[PDB]
Design a protein around this ligand. Structure first.
Ligand SMILES: CCCCCCCC/C=C\CCCCCCCC(=O)OC[C@@H](O)CO
Ligand SMILES: CCCCCCCC/C=C\CCCCCCCC(=O)OC[C@@H](O)CO
Ligand SMILES: *C/C=C(C)/C=C/C=C(C)/C=C/C1=C(C)CCCC1(C)C
Ligand SMILES: CCCCCCCCCCCCCCCC
Ligand SMILES: CCCCCCCCCCCCCC
Ligand SMILES: CCCCCCCCCCCC
Ligand SMILES: CCCCCCCCCCCC
Ligand SMILES: CCCCCCCCCC
Ligand SMILES: CCCCCCCCCC
Length: 235
């Protein structure tokens, strides 16, 4: 029970690796956008911001994680709480959604509640992360419902023509969004096993979310950027 409940040099090394990749992606996108026509540049800037924020967060986690503070719980159930990741997510997950929202004609009211659910989800996550005992699962479950809500909203332009910008390319939107949803559903599983249940150790949770973050940010960004380039080229 509660195995390996503090970050070690294993977790720290993993964070430095993810830091390096996020920083490199931000730099590469920042140089690339200089060569691209103006209508494409917003999408590059969104992804430059995502990767820059993530690099900053991983720098913070790698430099400070060895302090083995703060913690939640006492005695044998005490476990380190890494909370920088939530500060990352409250800014980057709306930007990740924005990547796809930019490919739609969703009205402002709809974008608003999708983004609102997203921010709520992260908020319930960090509150749950610091909550000792069974009430943590109320936060968890409501956060999971918020993921379902934001996903439902993002799904609607797929089959609602009035929400579509360029219908002939619904396929690219659909594919990117399914990729995003698959990855995002893994995050609460990791949280449930780690921050929530104390079933997996802190280094393991670090590595798992490191892998997810690489897939969900710079690899996802490359997919989005390729999509908007190809679509713009065909218009
Ligand atoms: C122009 C606005 C740009 C967006 C606003 C800033 C975005 C935030 C950037 C990075 C967020 C993650 C860094 C947040 C820093 C977390 C601090 C930490 O890791 O604590 C370690 C513990 O040992 C101490 O208790
Ligand atoms: C659309 C494609 C979706 C792909 C989803 C891939 C999700 C990957 C995330 C997590 C998978 C598990 C990887 C984590 C691998 C285990 C980490 C580990 O063993 O830590 C070392 C310890 O033994 C020492 O303490
Ligand atoms: C780049 C960072 C990403 C894509 C982070 C995504 C995070 C989530 C999808 C978080 C989901 C959560 C729940 C649905 C319930 C509460 C716990 C969270 C915050 C891990
Ligand atoms: C679209 C919402 C999907 C939410 C999926 C949540 C999966 C939760 C799995 C939790 C695994 C850890 C169980 C707790 C062990 C103590
Ligand atoms: C949209 C569907 C929401 C599903 C929420 C799933 C929550 C998983 C329950 C984990 C609780 C474990 C308590 C020990
Ligand atoms: C705390 C809320 C942070 C949100 C910052 C990201 C905003 C992304 C733009 C959403 C579309 C308007
Ligand atoms: C040490 C464990 C390595 C796990 C590698 C997972 C990589 C996921 C690739 C998914 C591609 C879509
Ligand atoms: C009408 C059905 C609404 C279901 C919301 C969940 C969206 C699918 C997430 C996989
Ligand atoms: C720049 C894109 C990096 C994607 C890395 C995906 C592999 C993660 C497991 C090693």
């Amino acid at each position: 029970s509660n195995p390996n409940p503090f970050q070690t040099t294993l977790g720290t090394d993993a964070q430095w690796v993810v830091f390096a990749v996020m920083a490199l992606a931000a730099i590469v996108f920042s140089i690339a956008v200089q060569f691209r026509p103006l209508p494409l540049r917003l999408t590059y800037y969104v992804n430059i911001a995502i990767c820059t924020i993530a690099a900053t967060a991983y720098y913070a986690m790698a430099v400070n994680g060895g302090d083995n503070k703060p913690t939640a719980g006492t005695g044998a159930d005490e476990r380190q709480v890494i909370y920088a990741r939530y500060i990352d997510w409250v800014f980057t997950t709306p930007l990740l959604l924005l990547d796809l929202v930019l490919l739609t004609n969703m009205p402002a009211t709809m974008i608003a509640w999708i983004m609102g659910a997203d921010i709520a989800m992260i908020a319930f996550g960090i509150i749950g992360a610091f909550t000792v005992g069974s009430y943590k699962w109320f936060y968890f479950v409501v956060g999971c419902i918020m993921l379902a809500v934001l996903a439902w909203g993002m799904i609607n332009p797929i089959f609602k023509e009035e929400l579509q910008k360029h219908k002939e390319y619904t396929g690219a939107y659909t594919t990117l969004l399914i990729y995003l949803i698959v990855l995002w559903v893994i995050y609460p599983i990791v949280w449930g096993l780690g921050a929530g249940g104390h079933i997996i150790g802190v280094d393991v949770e670090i590595i798992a979310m490191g892998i997810l973050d690489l897939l969900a940010k710079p690899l996802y960004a490359i997919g989005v950027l390729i999509t908007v380039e190809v679509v713009y080229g065909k218009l």
